Design a protein around this ligand. Sequence first.
Ligand SMILES: Nc1ncnc2c1ncn2[C@@H]1O[C@H](COP(=O)(O)OP(=O)(O)NP(=O)(O)O)[C@@H](O)[C@H]1O
Ligand SMILES: [Mg+2]
Lengths: 258, 198, 613, 171, 561
Amino acid sequence: MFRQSSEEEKKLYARLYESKLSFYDLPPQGEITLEQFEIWAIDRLKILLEIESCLSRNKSIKEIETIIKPQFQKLLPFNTESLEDRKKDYYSHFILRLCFCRSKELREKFVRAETFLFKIRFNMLTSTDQTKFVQSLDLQFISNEEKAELSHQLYQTVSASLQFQLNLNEEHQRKQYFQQEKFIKLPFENVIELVGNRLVFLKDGYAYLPQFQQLNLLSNEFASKLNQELIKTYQYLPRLNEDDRLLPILNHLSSGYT
Amino acid sequence: ITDVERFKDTVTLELSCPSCDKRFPFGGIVSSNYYRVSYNGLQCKHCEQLFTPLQLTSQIEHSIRAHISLYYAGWLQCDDSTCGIVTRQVSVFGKRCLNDGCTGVMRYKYSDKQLYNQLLYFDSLFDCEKNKKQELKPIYLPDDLDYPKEQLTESSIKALTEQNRELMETGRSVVQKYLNDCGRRYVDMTSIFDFMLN
Amino acid sequence: DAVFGDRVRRFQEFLDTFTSYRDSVRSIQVYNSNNAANNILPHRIIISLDDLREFDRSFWSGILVEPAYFIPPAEKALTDLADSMDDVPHPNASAVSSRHPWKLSFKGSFGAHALSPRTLTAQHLNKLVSVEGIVTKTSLVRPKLIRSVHYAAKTGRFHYRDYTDATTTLTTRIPTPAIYPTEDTEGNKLTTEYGYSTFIDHQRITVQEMPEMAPAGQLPRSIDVILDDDLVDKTKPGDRVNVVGVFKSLGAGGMNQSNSNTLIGFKTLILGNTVYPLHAARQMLTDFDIRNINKLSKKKDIFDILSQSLAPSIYGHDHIKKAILLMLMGGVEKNLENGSHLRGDINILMVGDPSTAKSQLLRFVLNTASLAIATTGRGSSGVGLTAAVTTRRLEAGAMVLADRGVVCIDEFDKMTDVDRVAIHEVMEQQTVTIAKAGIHTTLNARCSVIAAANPVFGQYDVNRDPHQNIALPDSLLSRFDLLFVVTDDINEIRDRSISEHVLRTHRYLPPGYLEGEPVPKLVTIPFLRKYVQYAKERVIPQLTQEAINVIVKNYTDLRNDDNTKKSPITARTLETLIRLATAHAKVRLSKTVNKVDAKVAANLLRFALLGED
Amino acid sequence: MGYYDIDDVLADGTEFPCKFQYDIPGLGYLENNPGRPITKNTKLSLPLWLARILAIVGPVPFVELLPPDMFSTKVMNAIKTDPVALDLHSINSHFFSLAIKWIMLFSEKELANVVSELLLQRAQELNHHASSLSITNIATSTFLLKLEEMEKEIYKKSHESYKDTKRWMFK
Amino acid sequence: MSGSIDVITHFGPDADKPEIITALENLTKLHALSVEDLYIKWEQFSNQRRQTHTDLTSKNIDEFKQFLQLQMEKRANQIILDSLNPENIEISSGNPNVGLLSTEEPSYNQVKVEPFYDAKKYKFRTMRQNLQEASDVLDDQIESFTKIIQNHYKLSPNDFADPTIQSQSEIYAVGRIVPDSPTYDKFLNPESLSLETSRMGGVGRRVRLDLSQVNELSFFLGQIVAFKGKNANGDYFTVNSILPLPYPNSPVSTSQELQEFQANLEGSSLKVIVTCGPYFANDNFSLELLQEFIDSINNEVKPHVLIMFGPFIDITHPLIASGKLPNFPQFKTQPKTLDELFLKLFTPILKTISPHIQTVLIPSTKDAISNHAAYPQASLIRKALQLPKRNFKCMANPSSFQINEIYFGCSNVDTFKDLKEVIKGGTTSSRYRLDRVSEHILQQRRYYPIFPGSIRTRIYEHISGADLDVSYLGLTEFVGGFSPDIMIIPSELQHFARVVQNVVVINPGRFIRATGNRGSYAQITVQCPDLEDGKLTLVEGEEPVYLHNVWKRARVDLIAS
Ligand SMILES: Nc1ncnc2c1ncn2[C@@H]1O[C@H](COP(=O)(O)OP(=O)(O)NP(=O)(O)O)[C@@H](O)[C@H]1O
Ligand SMILES: [Mg+2]
């Protein structure tokens, strides 16, 4: 049969937003303006302020999504090819690190708001984008034999969840989906919130988690790594103090949360 | 921060008429007793001379370059109120006062902040959106003797700004030429992330 | 089931990307919201299929090859877009549960799926197709139940349920028995709430291949189409139409036990998604047309330019061309407060020798008027020319069909006396009335009449009276505004001019052809039609004192002075003067009639009546 | 593109729309009136061998070329939806020659991408009908009435090759 | 009458109500369109709304006003005087390839112009001077000179001591000449001079100088100096002797390089023309003299290299300062900025220079075409000036570049005018001033050794100055630590050409005077380097190298422009 046969910064951000979401993993490079610094930080701050306001009002995920999604196109665009939007998102997050690393209360509030925004944006993805984003983060499925041996217990665990979360009222549909569903084994301490609600099957200190659940692990890893980075960002705040022109902006940004 | 607060200490732009030599303050597309902005451009009210784009842009550039040269004249002032010495001499310590016995700190009389705010004030005068929104620094107060009697309507200001968009953009490009070379502007992330270089 | 959500998401991405469709949603919504506080536009949008091709090929081919699985989620996404946008608060009871989503339509580049009724084939079932043909039948409009609402007497709870039928949905579901529930699950007696329930309109039509494409005198073939909601009654029989929709099958096809031995086939239909007409008359002006029309009107002699631009291939007869132009403009129709009616439209007659371009000039009006019907005098009867009975149903004739238009009658002299007298009402009262067995009705016929005839002796005889030459009663000739006599007088230079003119005409070649291949300033006819349309719609000249001063004097002098005038002069002559003055003012785009218009109208009437200027 | 090539000689004679940028005396014969001048902003349809030069020679050249109808947007959409079904013979007899000439004249990038896809997609069905040898007429004949003059030569030279090989083999 | 009937003859007689008349009159007065134009646009407005009842009411007229503004904004969106060495050296014949039409590549007679500095270091952002960085530069200058002096005179580090501390023993001290009063009033005598020490040498303190025991001296502000003396009383440092600063070395080349440069010119002499701005008078923008000069350059002079110093467009030009720029009838489209003014006036004229003439452009700090408004200054952007890459090279200010073997040192700041000397003694005063200034430039090893820089004031308002960015003054030093063979520093003073310590120092003068009279330019003829004629001096070492001795083999002619 017949057969034939700075740029680096732009490539870096194209790589970082190929998945459409990021753990905000790497040091930015090059330059932006100070007006851009202030405005981008304030835009992300406004979105996170509304997220914290809705959570203090005890609104659900669907209501918060209805409230926040129109604001991305104005303040912080998502699901976009634009280099400007991608840099805006990345730099705004990194600025609010320096604003909110200063104290435990600020770190907790920033981690909570940013993790909830991470959850919202993850919900906006297609399943293919979610799979690719999870795989890019380098994030144990059980064998078919182990699934067969534990099939009764796993099905008893997930059958109600399949009906209520995936709307599979028919038992026939639930059985077919369960036949097609994969499960993850890990220590029970890692998914303890699902353990307290009895949403996972426990055996010998290991929790058995279906594939259609487990986003709390992703968001918890995001929150934990963000907290560790904020603790690190706190430790080298004395290097931030070499430029006086940034401190009034950060004080202004933090004043809205105090 | 409003333009009124930001540009409180800036020097007002003065334009000299090419025909009758009368100097007047320029405050963008606003009512004035000395000039009128028509559909054809800037016109002097004293002699009805219409300014060409070059005549306006050269005067703007001359004012910018005068401010830059004043900045690089390098006048220093001691911040101690008792000493208050003004000199262009720079010690090898820079901030040490040259008067014997004085512990005050020498600072530039015309700082880079003042120059940058001056250049932005020039840039603001030729921003079309600020002219439409009437957000510019006022060149007259209501109690001033030269306060114009007839005020331009908001619709008239928007129409004149649309009609003169090319001229305003040209003057703003002349200002932006120098603002892009001002060192006070940008923030380098590559050097800033030295902790990842730990 | 999960695939339904992703397709909704993908079409949401499409609607966000191409922003011109958001503006359509918002404009329809704000327009409807405005007038509601005092017509209403439908909840329908037309998308370009090319945009969907360039956005996502997989969705484009999915729409175009598997419509049953792709059209519903996209429509759902459009409804979500329109619902999220701001809307008027506190809706009424009926508005709260209307069950009325938005709906889609398509245009552009169907490719292989553009078909005709002859070639629609079993391979194309369940595809999205476009067909062309002529409408032949239309059913009566009927309502159709889709949802009902019920109030429980004891508990105070409102209940509801939905219904489906095979033609209501692209996807297939178990049919519903159309029964109203009388009793609650908990035994409470129910009541039906009409006005909160929802009904929709329904209509079936039939479309046939055009006769121009019929092979070998073979039987023609046709398809039935289903319409609903907004698409109802937008067509009538005889319309040439292009229809877009999904081609689908129905029924059990005899496999449910039948005597046929299953030789009979399944039934098939097209579910109407969009309908477009075909031009086979009207035009819509652009801004440049308005500018040109207003600028041209200020020339000193617009009337001469426009009149001479009518039928340039015919030499001479300036006054008849000017009269035809004034006919095409027309007067102003009056309706007084007490219900009395005063005529507005102008009628013209021309009689003359053989070969003098009567029929050729009459043919020109048929190809520049917006609505025109043509007939020959001897090929039409009185009932056929006005109206007839059938089964009781009453059927319209030619003068009734052209209501606000012009009717051309050639060979007027050959019409029998029994046929002519039917026309005396239509040319003044502009109505047709029938009183026959089992029927009494009145019909409207507002048209202008132009006709041609031959004199009695074969050529006009100046040595005998005009009545002797023109054998028609005085009561009929009175109804024609302008009567023209034309003759073929032999003269050297006249003959040379006409012969050179027609020889120059016959040497024309169209632009795109080599020689021998088979096939002042004059405005083009496509511009003149726009000029006439604009002038007829947008300007309504009112009369003035200065014109009246001329009209009264001319009328009283013309009636009383003894002359050999060729037509009876009656009270209708004054109306002719007023109509002609108004029409000439309308040519000028003047808001008022002036002295000049009356002067010109008088000079034209004097030429036609007394034969000399 | 040889000098003596008949098809190139004949393709250059197709007319394109044009607009003038100077008034010139005596050249009214282009407007079929030798006794009058040409005037600025007059629009005329001229053959390509003349418009190709009057658009270049000066400054402002004498003539500006208007976008012809055979490269209109409707044709491009029709090409991109279904190239195989398209009746290019009715659109223009010498489509793929004028396309290359226009691309050379204006250095279009996107038009080249469209035309390359069109040619490549139609070559497949052309080869299909070339390979099909009788041991049928209507099915072949319906498609072969929508070929350009350019495509007919390729079809003939393919069909004869296949036929000669078959005749030699089964002999 | 007129407006009312004009409305009523286009709009219907329903417009007779005076409010309607007033509204339509307001529209035509606001937008300048006639009544019939307003009627036409009203007819446009009546279209496309399904509103057959487009009645001439107040609300409809308000919507028509909104429509008119929408159409307006949418339409907007749519739319020989003196000579050095004349008796020994003949004027060069120039480049023989100049004037030849041939497109053929200029194969043999290629004078190589190569920059001898890092252009990237000059691309720093201006208008941000940290006082600490400036003070660091000023201190580093004193320390570098201290090291040079220690190595040259073979002094121990302990021989240097603080001159501000009382000492009975004689010490060596290196520092900067500074005024005794920080508020000095523009006139310095020998009795008002103080020595500023480095941070390490004397903790940056200043000590008054007692120069009574010195008979001959020539000092200026910002000069780095070295003294042997004592501070007996603690108030003034008594200078016993001035240590002359060592001159920098001269550039050298190998025998192979000199033979290559000899083969490149085929034994002919190099010809270089040097001009300095302004290129038009103070009362107009005529470049007729420049056009005539370029025609002479292309047809008669035929130089190998042309060096053009700015300012090309002097921002301090009187017409620019007063805003009285004339209309230019020769241009179809008038310029809108000074950059466009350069592109319309200078660029057509400069493009007529022959491609065989290598053109070097050096900016001025007063040039409107340069956004880098500080000394040291970045090069002009050649692409922005639309000049051809083949034969135009834009260099920094100051610029060190090499023409064949010859090292050129160029600085477009008026060091000769600005440097004001405090002199004492008959022998020093009898010597020519510009010689002493050139020696100060060579000894300090910087093209503009004055600090604080000069300023120009009018009755006081600041006009202009040297415009020094103090943090980057290291770029103003001689590159490589050696003097140039030829030093060019244009000055407002009278043109001259002189040999000062084996360096040919040239002031070409202004190209045109303020009155429009002809100024001057410099024509430099340098004979080819020949190893056999004895004009080159062999320096013995591991690899034998030769001093260029350009001053022995260079002729400089100052010629009326
Ligand atoms: N200027 C002209 N005057 C007269 N006849 C003309 C003229 N130009 C063309 N004709 C030709 O004259 C012929 C007769 O036209 P036609 O309209 O039939 O006359 P007519 O009045 O209808 N005769 P008839 O049918 O017996 O009443 C046609 O072939 C026309 O093309
Ligand atoms: Mg006839």
